[PDB]
Design an enzyme around this catalytic site. Structure first.
Site, PDB file in Angstrom:
ATOM      1  N   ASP A   1      -2.079 -30.146 -28.580  1.00  0.00           N
ATOM      2  CA  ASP A   1      -0.982 -29.558 -29.390  1.00  0.00           C
ATOM      3  C   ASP A   1       0.360 -29.186 -28.511  1.00  0.00           C
ATOM      4  O   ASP A   1       0.451 -28.374 -27.695  1.00  0.00           O
ATOM      5  CB  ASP A   1      -1.402 -28.278 -29.706  1.00  0.00           C
ATOM      6  CG  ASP A   1      -0.432 -27.321 -30.641  1.00  0.00           C
ATOM      7  OD1 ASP A   1       0.594 -27.752 -30.875  1.00  0.00           O
ATOM      8  OD2 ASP A   1      -1.088 -26.412 -31.303  1.00  0.00           O
ATOM      9  N   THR A   2       1.217 -30.138 -28.722  1.00  0.00           N
ATOM     10  CA  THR A   2       2.414 -29.891 -27.788  1.00  0.00           C
ATOM     11  C   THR A   2       3.553 -28.638 -28.378  1.00  0.00           C
ATOM     12  O   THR A   2       4.217 -28.175 -27.528  1.00  0.00           O
ATOM     13  CB  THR A   2       3.462 -31.429 -28.078  1.00  0.00           C
ATOM     14  OG1 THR A   2       3.883 -31.230 -29.657  1.00  0.00           O
ATOM     15  CG2 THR A   2       3.027 -32.504 -27.917  1.00  0.00           C
ATOM     16  N   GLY A   3       2.880 -28.015 -29.203  1.00  0.00           N
ATOM     17  CA  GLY A   3       3.707 -26.880 -29.885  1.00  0.00           C
ATOM     18  C   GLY A   3       3.323 -25.651 -29.109  1.00  0.00           C
ATOM     19  O   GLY A   3       3.795 -24.381 -29.474  1.00  0.00           O
TER      20      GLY A   3
HETATM   21  C1  017 Z   1       3.890 -21.790 -33.784  1.00  0.00           C
HETATM   22  C2  017 Z   1       4.067 -22.408 -32.685  1.00  0.00           C
HETATM   23  C3  017 Z   1       5.157 -22.267 -32.069  1.00  0.00           C
HETATM   24  C4  017 Z   1       3.002 -21.777 -31.659  1.00  0.00           C
HETATM   25  N1  017 Z   1       1.199 -22.121 -32.000  1.00  0.00           N
HETATM   26  C5  017 Z   1       0.774 -23.591 -31.727  1.00  0.00           C
HETATM   27  C6  017 Z   1       0.963 -24.230 -33.234  1.00  0.00           C
HETATM   28  O1  017 Z   1       0.850 -25.662 -33.032  1.00  0.00           O
HETATM   29  C7  017 Z   1      -0.044 -23.996 -34.312  1.00  0.00           C
HETATM   30  C8  017 Z   1      -1.451 -24.488 -34.036  1.00  0.00           C
HETATM   31  C9  017 Z   1      -2.321 -23.832 -35.050  1.00  0.00           C
HETATM   32  C10 017 Z   1      -2.930 -24.899 -35.899  1.00  0.00           C
HETATM   33  C11 017 Z   1      -3.898 -24.359 -36.859  1.00  0.00           C
HETATM   34  C12 017 Z   1      -4.180 -23.208 -37.158  1.00  0.00           C
HETATM   35  C13 017 Z   1      -3.452 -22.182 -36.397  1.00  0.00           C
HETATM   36  C14 017 Z   1      -2.624 -22.500 -35.286  1.00  0.00           C
HETATM   37  N2  017 Z   1       0.484 -24.689 -35.387  1.00  0.00           N
HETATM   38  C15 017 Z   1       0.738 -23.895 -36.687  1.00  0.00           C
HETATM   39  O2  017 Z   1       1.266 -22.773 -36.732  1.00  0.00           O
HETATM   40  O3  017 Z   1       1.025 -24.808 -37.667  1.00  0.00           O
HETATM   41  C16 017 Z   1       1.256 -24.112 -38.957  1.00  0.00           C
HETATM   42  C17 017 Z   1       2.235 -25.110 -39.481  1.00  0.00           C
HETATM   43  O4  017 Z   1       1.646 -26.061 -40.096  1.00  0.00           O
HETATM   44  C18 017 Z   1       0.356 -25.611 -40.477  1.00  0.00           C
HETATM   45  O5  017 Z   1      -0.756 -26.432 -39.769  1.00  0.00           O
HETATM   46  C19 017 Z   1      -1.549 -25.797 -38.838  1.00  0.00           C
HETATM   47  C20 017 Z   1      -1.386 -24.355 -38.978  1.00  0.00           C
HETATM   48  C21 017 Z   1      -0.085 -24.268 -39.872  1.00  0.00           C
HETATM   49  S1  017 Z   1       0.461 -21.250 -32.018  1.00  0.00           S
HETATM   50  O6  017 Z   1      -0.767 -21.544 -32.548  1.00  0.00           O
HETATM   51  O7  017 Z   1       0.643 -19.805 -32.923  1.00  0.00           O
HETATM   52  C22 017 Z   1       0.222 -20.692 -30.146  1.00  0.00           C
HETATM   53  C23 017 Z   1       1.031 -19.703 -29.886  1.00  0.00           C
HETATM   54  C24 017 Z   1       0.827 -19.564 -28.299  1.00  0.00           C
HETATM   55  C25 017 Z   1      -0.123 -20.184 -27.635  1.00  0.00           C
HETATM   56  N3  017 Z   1      -0.249 -20.337 -26.198  1.00  0.00           N
HETATM   57  C26 017 Z   1      -0.712 -21.170 -28.311  1.00  0.00           C
HETATM   58  C27 017 Z   1      -0.797 -21.412 -29.505  1.00  0.00           C
END
Ligand code: 017
Lengths: 99, 99
Positions: B25-27
């Site tokens: 996860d690059t995000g």
């Molecule tokens: C919103 C981002 C800036 C940050 N996030 C990582 C992100 O990649 C998450 C990673 C993620 C993946 C699945 C479930 C929850 C979080 N993805 C996410 O929110 O994606 C949403 C948009 O597309 C959908 O697909 C997945 C969930 C929806 S995060 O999970 O909130 C997060 C925040 C802080 C840390 N240390 C680690 C992770």
């Protein structure tokens, strides 16, 4: 380019004609952009992330430039903490992870 | 390896003697792993994303194997819906995003 991950992979995008900063986010299925005026029809939807669910506006077939590359696809607009470019558009610009 | 983004970039990891599937996860700044009973000292933390925040336990200098690559660093443990390998460890295994 090749982008290393010591810093956040932030890029400039253009959407609705406006420049914004966004995070290339391989953990996101979907692209989610902060609240903005965007031309186009939209549908109410919800999406879930790490902390719960939010309401978003789903805009389909939106033309967006990402780091100088063209994509046309779905953009969810709503109260995301960060503008995130998700896999639906990363695949369009030919992005892969490599190690 | 090269991992395309048509599907979620899930890989097998080993942490605390357990195998799990996790997102590359690059995000994510930090690595976040589903609740598990890790031994050792930790510090309380809260991390936020779409939907809000979750409370996690911050463990430092945790050894973790990611798709066969060894890494050692900070792992956050708590009620995340998906196991997430964030940039803090993606850099250690030499991961880049390319387009
Ligand atoms: C919103 C981002 C800036 C940050 N996030 C990582 C992100 O990649 C998450 C990673 C993620 C993946 C699945 C479930 C929850 C979080 N993805 C996410 O929110 O994606 C949403 C948009 O597309 C959908 O697909 C997945 C969930 C929806 S995060 O999970 O909130 C997060 C925040 C802080 C840390 N240390 C680690 C992770």
């Amino acid at each position: 380019p090749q982008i290393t991950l010591w810093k956040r992979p932030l890029v400039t995008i253009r959407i609705g004609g406006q420049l914004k900063e966004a995070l290339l986010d391989t953990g996101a299925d979907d692209t989610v952009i902060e609240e903005m005026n965007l031309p186009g029809k939209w549908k109410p939807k919800m999406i879930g992330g790490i902390g719960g669910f939010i309401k978003v506006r789903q805009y389909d077939q939106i033309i967006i430039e990402i780091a100088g590359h063209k994509a046309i696809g779905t953009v969810l607009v709503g109260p995301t903490p960060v503008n995130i470019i998700g896999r639906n558009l990363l695949t369009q610009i030919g992005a892969t992870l490599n190690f």
